[PDB]
Amino acid sequence: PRGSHMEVPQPTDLSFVDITDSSIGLRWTPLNSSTIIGYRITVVAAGEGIPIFEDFVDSSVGYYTVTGLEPGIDYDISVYTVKNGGESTPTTLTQQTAVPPPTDLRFTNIGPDTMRVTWAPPPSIDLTNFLVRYSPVKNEEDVAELSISPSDNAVVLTNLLPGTEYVVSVSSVYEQHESTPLRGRQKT
């Protein structure tokens, strides 16, 4: 088959960085095979079959990018070492672009048992909702939850206990997938 040889090693140390705004960066360490032609990289969502993406770089390149990925969906990335119409077996790994969390959580005690909580939503994403979780700092198991409109950047928590500290987390939710929690704590 491929015959003429000293096999074509694949690369190693495949690395993937994401979020930062839909941009996935893929980097790796050069293969061993002497006189390489370049690399071929594919990114494919882990499900249906049409959305595969491909890019090809030169031998002197060790990274490449893919844009506008879907938040919360798993992608498999494969890098092949290329040598004039000859390719190595690929190295691969999976990546799940994070759902952008909200930012800058602010507390405003508006009553002895009431507090207003506001935040800045993640720009450029049509969220399903924000999920608010809160509980006393001494009993995180007495957590309470609230599902807030994606167009809403605030919520009033009521019926809180006097002289009590609460832990409040706000999470973006996009098709069942939550962002890391935006967390803060305040005392009534």
Please give the biggest Cα pair distance in the chain. 81
44, two tokens = 């494919």
Per the entry, the structure determination technique was X-ray
Q: Alpha-carbon distance 165 to 171, whole Å?
A: 20
Q: Which CATH number does the domain housing residue 184 bear? A: 2.60.40.10
Q: What is the DSSP secondary-structure string of 99-150? A: PPP-EEEEEEEEETTEEEEEEEPPSS---SEEEEEEEETT-GGG-EEEEE-T
Residues in the chain: 188
Boundaries of domain holding 155: 98-188
Tally of structural domains, the chain: 2
* Radius of gyration of the chain measured on its C-alpha atoms: 24
Q: Are 158 and 144 in contact (CB under 8 A)?
A: no
Q: Are 55 and 63 in contact (CB under 8 A)?
A: no
68, two tokens = 């506008």
Final residue of a structural domain among 38, 72, 97? 97
Amino acid at 28: W
**Residue 40 and residue 121 in one domain:** no
Residue 19 CA to its chain's centroid (Å): 5
Helices (H) and strands (E) in the chain, counts: 0, 15
Task: Tell me 6's DSSP state.
Answer: S
**Residue 50 and residue 117 in one domain:** no
Q: Which parts of the chain fold into alpha helices (H)?
A: none
b/e map 149-173, b = 16+ CB within 10 Å: ebeebebebeebeeeeebbbbbbbb
